[PDB]
Symmetry: C2
Subunit: 133 residues, 2 copies
């Protein structure tokens, strides 16, 4: 239900910066990146309280509609009702995801994407700024 | 076609800022804003050298697929191979479009939009950042 952007043409090296507002009573939010809605190199899902999980970032890929192997990340630098920025870069092998509080992690480029052209936000997160570096 | 964004949810009084690179040898570019691709409160079209026009900004609306009456502006603060930012806000009566070099113009809110949810860029203009505040 959130912002949906296409024709991003993000290439290796370039940096995608997304800043937004986390809802005051947020349960969770999603930032999906990829080729289109059926081919996601990154489903980024911070969960405050959803599906039985509290404060955990869940990530996965989707290839031709098929979800890959899900994984929970090590940190959760997000708070309800607050501003947050996430930054993404990628190359042939990995996406690098930079988070608030100086944390970051890499996620395998399972789909072997050469560009990222699609981004969609869902849940309790409203995008207010997008920048291409 | 350049960046396309939907579900922007720009509300009255909020400011939409779009900054991009005007390509060298640019002939023209377009920034479309509205409810969706068929309902545009603003088709903003700076023409450097296109369709018989030189250094002229042409604007229009589109309602249910039908183009309105084109509007010519009186200034052209753009140049090929450079960065340019436009800022847009609206109320019930008019959109206000702020351009480089301190120029601005108003364009009637023909569709009586109460929010802007769609933005698309075309032509020789590559969006570097978009913000809502």
């Amino acid at each position: 239900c959130g912002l949906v952007a296409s024709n991003l043409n993000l290439k290796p090296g370039e940096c995608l910066r997304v800043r937004g507002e986390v809802a005051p009573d947020a349960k969770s939010f999603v930032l999906n990146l990829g080729k289109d809605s059926n081919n996601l190199c990154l489903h980024f899902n911070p969960r405050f309280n959803a599906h039985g999980d509290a404060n955990t970032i869940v990530c996965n890929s989707k290839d031709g509609g098929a979800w890959g192997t899900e994984q929970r990340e090590a940190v959760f630098p997000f708070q309800p009702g607050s501003v947050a920025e996430v930054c993404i870069t990628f190359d042939q092998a990995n996406l690098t995801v930079k988070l608030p509080d100086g944390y970051e992690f890499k996620f395998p480029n399972r789909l072997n994407l050469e560009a990222i052209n699609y981004m969609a936000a869902d849940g309790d997160f409203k995008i207010k700024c997008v920048a291409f570096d």
